[PDB]
Design a protein around this ligand. Structure first.
Ligand SMILES: [Zn+2]
Ligand SMILES: [Zn+2]
Ligand SMILES: [Zn+2]
Lengths: 97, 127, 25, 91, 81, 160, 150, 97, 101
RNA sequence: GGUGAAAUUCUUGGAUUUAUUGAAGACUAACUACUGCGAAAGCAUUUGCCAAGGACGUUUUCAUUAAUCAAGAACGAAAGUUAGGGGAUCGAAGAUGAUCAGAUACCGUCGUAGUCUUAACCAUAAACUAUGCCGACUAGGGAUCGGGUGGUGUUUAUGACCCACUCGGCACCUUACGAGAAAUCAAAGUCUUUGGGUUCUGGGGGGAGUAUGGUCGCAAGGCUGAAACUUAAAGGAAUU
């Protein structure tokens, strides 16, 4: 049956948009469908920057940070990312916390 | 007071490149791979096999005059899959062992304004 | 089977009912 | 009446020579016998002279064009490519 | 809601109604007096106007048509008449 | 500079002639760094791009850009905050008037001097009052096309 | 129901309730016969003359200033055209787009509506023949369109 | 958009069509604002605008050619050059420049 | 000449050595593409219509654009006669009979 | 290089990383969303030109001009087909390194037709919202795009933003004492209290979209399309 209301892909009243391909398995999915997420990390390890960057004149220069936007798919998300199932009557929220 | 090289590592997947150059670019200095130091081919992504690569890279450069450097890292880059791996986090600490002089640590992974579609088929490389 | 490959078998015998039934006068 | 259904000009040849040896021809000489737009008057007064010569019956202007047209497909991209090139030296 | 008095409504409903769905439908536009800043005569231009009709002697400006109400936009008045 | 919070506006420098073991580079253009653009992108806002070709006092014909996102203004209730989308092709021609009209003119000793303290962005504060004020607007790139030839003459204005 | 596109709105007008109206106006009909025929030496576009007086003068409807509609007004003094008011504009839209179709010619999307609006050209034509406001059998083809619309 | 601007010249005043009737008018100054096509042979593109410089009138260069100026005046054949005699109620003669 | 053109242009009828008065790209509808200069060592690279490359000097002449009359191979000769009319103008190399005969 | 590991291949014929660049074709990322335009398939870089379309304002204009359609027509993603062009990337057919008792299957490197376009062609798809169009009623709310109105509102006359609205959109949420076999539903409601118009379709599964013709297509193939014989269930929904 119609196991979800908007069963696929957050798409009502337009038909078709374009596909955008997954990163690790490289399956093709339409960009409205599978997965949004931003993945900001950093660009340094555990820094210990007071003697990592005492060498760095113009002191520390950045607080350096990179941005990455990702596109998983349905068929590879539940083999890394921790959802893997949800029950019947709890599939309703949209904010992550 | 200082003189700046450009470290500019290449920590892609299944490899690790690192070579200081002049900022002119067309006078490079002493590239070193994941295959230079240790040989098992499992060791292309170990931490301590990635630190030895920048180890021989660093003290070879001080013998020429490279005191200060400009680290400006690079992942796979482009439509090649864009994310830093086990080298850029790890082997940059192997420039901290010399007390060598750092700066400007962000990436130059090139950005496709989407073009010339990827590989692995439409359906994707299922295992 | 799947109905994608039942249809492939019943489409490449229409190049046999069309061919050998035709010259058989 | 209608004369012929799908044969067209190739009733000239008749029963012989095959199908695709007559299909591929007949698309091409309708680009050869027929008139065009003479760009030096606007009127439809240009017809073939020879192997790649397209003269006009008025206006006395001859256009050296392709074999079965006055401007071919490969001829289209070069004339764009030339005034690509005239504004890396002028503008 | 189970009961009303549809023939005798309140007063704050008709302003929340439309041109086309009242009890007996009528317009929202209204004929309107403007005299020019220059001339003395009144041409009865109304604010839900069209193409920029102006006074017959000095046709400087009296109304500018928009997607909705045309406007006076300068000088004299609107009476409401 | 040493005034470090101009950590954006990356510069390439045309090295041209070696002036007797003290080689003095000539101007080439400007980039951003490759993440100051990306550190400004954000959902629920609107974007723009624009460009032109343009001459100068000589014919260093160059192709500048301009990017400008959209501010969350005061007293917002919506999250969206999107502009008109017919004003987008009304902002992108007026901003492509001012980035033109400073140039065609603007010698590379005064287009250079205008481009360092970002005088040009203050004009959009003062002339894009029309449709939306803006958030951060910058010029983001200048790259040449037609350096005429080697030009040993006018290079000598740049020295100590 | 809009019959050609999927709109549903009501963007129309609503005539006031009063017949006798508007209890302010000056001298009646006997100056307003030719006051619109005066403008009608300019052609004119006949349904447009109700809206060019209205935004300037109090004329509000043809029911108020005189007791006749502006077909029965305009025809009697010898003005009304052969193809009067809408089908003249509707085939003017038909002849305008076919000129566009003799150029670029790749428009499969834009000659779609020319098979759509010419289903409207025929429909209002054979209403006008049924009431015999236009004489029957009505030779209509887009070959001689510009000699018919002009 | 001067194509609508030419579409009311003909209904408001007097004009000519073709080559000879234009240069029939320039030799007594009754012409104003001759209009020129683009694929006219450039001898006669210049052979009339020489004396048009001498007969005080102004010139316009319509971007299309012979078979494009025909529809922008109302007729259904070619017209190379249009002189307009009087356009006393028209948005042309002052609106240029 | 091919030093007075910049890169990317599409020339034909150029000459191999300067003085040859046209030797290559003379056929019915071909072209030689310039595929790279160098200001010093004044010999330009080109792109010949079959798969070979070539280095010639900048003093080589050359017309711009593809030769007209091209695109004629598409119609079949399609009978014996108007193939026989074609060779009769050029040379005697027709009919070419076979070697197992 | 390459994956979990290994190699074909490329290697002191200087590769792979680099720097100054050019080209060549395809593609317009990041914004890009419970948002738009389009009849439907579809449509995201700038500008110009061409004509078109929905919405709203109306105290213009005609006065039943209308709904749904057999026959008959236009458009109609991808792969195809004919013949040209440019052939970067991917890449059925194929060859190859490994895995496999077994691989011409998955994986890895190469790779032809295609991919793009111009003239022409078939008319099929999960062409899905698995929900034929028109009309009129019956709950409450919050957002959202577009138009309009009104607010002594903010920002500095204008624009944007707020507020109260209103009309047409895409939907959503809360419930429905109604409907439904249930899942579910503002319509699948106003239906054994059994009638608002109108088009199309289906009668147990297999045989079978098959055979026979008709008919279209150059072709793959499409539309129309039975029967002999065989069997007592194939299915839908939710429970443990
Ligand atoms: Zn993937
Ligand atoms: Zn001619
Ligand atoms: Zn006035």
């Amino acid at each position: 049956p119609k196991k979800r209301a908007s069963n696929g892909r957050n798409k009502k009243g337009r038909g078709h948009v374009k596909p955008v391909r997954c990163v690790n398995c490289s399956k093709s999915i339409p960009k409205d469908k599978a997965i949004k997420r931003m993945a900001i990390r950093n660009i340094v390890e555990a820094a210990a920057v007071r003697d990592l960057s005492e060498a760095s004149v113009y002191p520390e220069y950045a607080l350096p940070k990179t941005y990455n936007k990702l596109h998983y798919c349905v068929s590879c998300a539940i083999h890394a990312r921790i959802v893997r199932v949800r029950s019947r009557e709890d599939r309703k929220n949209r904010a992550p916390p | 007071s200082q003189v700046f090289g450009v470290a500019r590592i290449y920590a892609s997947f299944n490899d690790t490149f690192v070579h200081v150059t002049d900022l002119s670019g067309k006078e490079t200095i002493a590239r070193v791979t994941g295959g230079m130091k240790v040989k098992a081919d499992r060791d292309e992504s170990s931490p301590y096999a990635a630190m030895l690569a920048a180890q021989d890279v660093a003290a070879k450069c001080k013998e020429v005059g490279i005191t200060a450097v400009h680290v400006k890292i690079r992942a796979t880059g482009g439509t090649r899959t864009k994310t830093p791996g086990p080298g850029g986090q790890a082997a940059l600490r192997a420039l901290a062992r010399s007390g060598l002089r750092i700066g400007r640590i962000e990436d130059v992974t090139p950005v496709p304004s989407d073009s010339t579609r990827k590989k692995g088929g439409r359906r994707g490389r299922r295992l | 089977m799947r109905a994608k490959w039942r249809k492939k078998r019943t489409r490449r015998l229409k190049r046999k009912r069309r061919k050998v039934r035709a010259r058989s006068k | 009446a209608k004369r012929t259904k799908k044969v067209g000009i190739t009733g000239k040849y008749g029963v012989r020579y095959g199908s695709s040896l007559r299909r591929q021809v007949k698309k091409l000489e309708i680009q050869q016998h027929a008139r065009y737009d003479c760009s030096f008057c606007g009127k439809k007064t240009v017809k073939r002279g020879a192997a790649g010569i397209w003269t006009c019956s008025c206006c006395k202007k001859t256009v050296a064009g392709g074999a079965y047209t006055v401007s071919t497909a490969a001829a289209a991209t070069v004339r764009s490519t030339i005034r690509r090139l005239r504004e890396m030296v002028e503008a | 809601v189970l009961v009303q008095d549809l023939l005798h409504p309140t007063a704050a409903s008709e302003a929340r109604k439309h041109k086309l769905k009242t009890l007996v439908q009528g317009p929202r536009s209204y004929f309107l007096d403007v005299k020019c800043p220059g001339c003395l005569n009144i041409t009865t231009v109304f604010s839900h106007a069209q193409t920029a009709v102006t006074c017959e002697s000095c046709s400087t400006i009296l109304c500018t048509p928009t997607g909705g109400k045309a406007k006076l936009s300068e000088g004299t008045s609107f009476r409401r008449k | 500079q040493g005034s470090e919070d101009h950590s954006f506006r990356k510069i390439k420098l045309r090295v041209d002639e070696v002036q007797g073991k003290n080689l003095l580079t000539n101007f080439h253009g400007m980039d951003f760094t490759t993440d100051k653009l990306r550190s400004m992108v954000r959902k629920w806002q609107t974007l723009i791009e624009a460009n032109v070709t343009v001459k100068t006092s000589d014919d260093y014909v160059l192709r500048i850009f301009a990017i400008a996102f959209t501010r969350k203004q005061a007293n917002q209730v919506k999250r969206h905050s999107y502009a008109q989308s017919s004003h987008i092709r009304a902002i992108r021609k007026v901003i492509s008037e001012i980035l033109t009209k400073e140039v065609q003119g603007s010698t590379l000793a005064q287009l250079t001097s205008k481009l360092i303290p970002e005088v040009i962005n203050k004009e959009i504060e003062n002339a894009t009052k029309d449709i939306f004020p803006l958030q951060n607007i910058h010029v983001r790139k200048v790259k040449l096309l037609k350096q005429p030839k080697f030009d040993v003459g006018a290079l000598m204005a740049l020295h100590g | 129901g809009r019959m050609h596109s999927a709109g549903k709105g009501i963007s129309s007008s609503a005539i006031p309730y009063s017949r006798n109206a508007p209890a302010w106006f000056k001298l009646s009909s006997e100056s307003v016969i030719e006051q619109i025929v005066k403008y009608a030496r300019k052609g004119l576009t006949p349904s447009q003359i109700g809206v060019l007086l209205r935004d300037a003068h109090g004329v509000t409807q043809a029911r108020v200033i005189t007791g006749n509609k502006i077909m029965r007004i305009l025809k009697s003094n010898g003005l009304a055209p052969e193809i009067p008011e809408d089908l003249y504009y509707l085939i003017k839209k038909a002849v305008s787009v076919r000129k566009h179709l003799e150029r670029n010619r790749k428009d499969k999307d834009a000659k779609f509506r020319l098979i759509l609006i010419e289903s409207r050209i025929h429909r209002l034509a054979r209403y006008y023949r049924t009431v015999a406001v236009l004489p029957p059998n009505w030779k209509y083809e887009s070959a001689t369109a510009s000699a018919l619309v002009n | 958009s001067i194509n609508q601007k030419l579409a009311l010249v003909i209904k408001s005043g007097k004009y000519t069509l073709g080559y000879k009737s234009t240069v029939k008018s320039l030799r007594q100054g009754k012409s104003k604002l001759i209009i020129i096509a683009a694929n006219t042979p450039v001898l006669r593109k210049s052979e009339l605008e020489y004396y048009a410089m001498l007969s005080k009138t102004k010139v316009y260069y319509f971007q299309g050619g012979n078979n494009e100026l025909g529809t922008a005046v109302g007729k259904l054949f070619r017209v190379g050059v249009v002189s307009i005699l009087e356009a006393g109620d028209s948005d042309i003669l002052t609106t240029l420049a | 000449p091919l030093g007075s053109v910049p890169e990317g242009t599409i020339v034909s009828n150029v000459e191999e050595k300067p003085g040859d008065r046209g030797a290559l790209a003379r056929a019915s509808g071909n072209y030689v593409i310039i595929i790279g200069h160098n200001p010093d060592e004044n010999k330009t690279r080109v792109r010949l219509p079959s798969g070979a490359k070539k280095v010639i000097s900048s003093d080589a002449r050359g017309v711009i654009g593809v030769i007209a009359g091209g695109g004629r191979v598409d119609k079949p000769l399609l009978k014996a006669g108007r193939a026989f009319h074609k060779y009769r103008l050029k040379r005697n190399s027709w009919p070419k009979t076979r070697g197992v005969a």
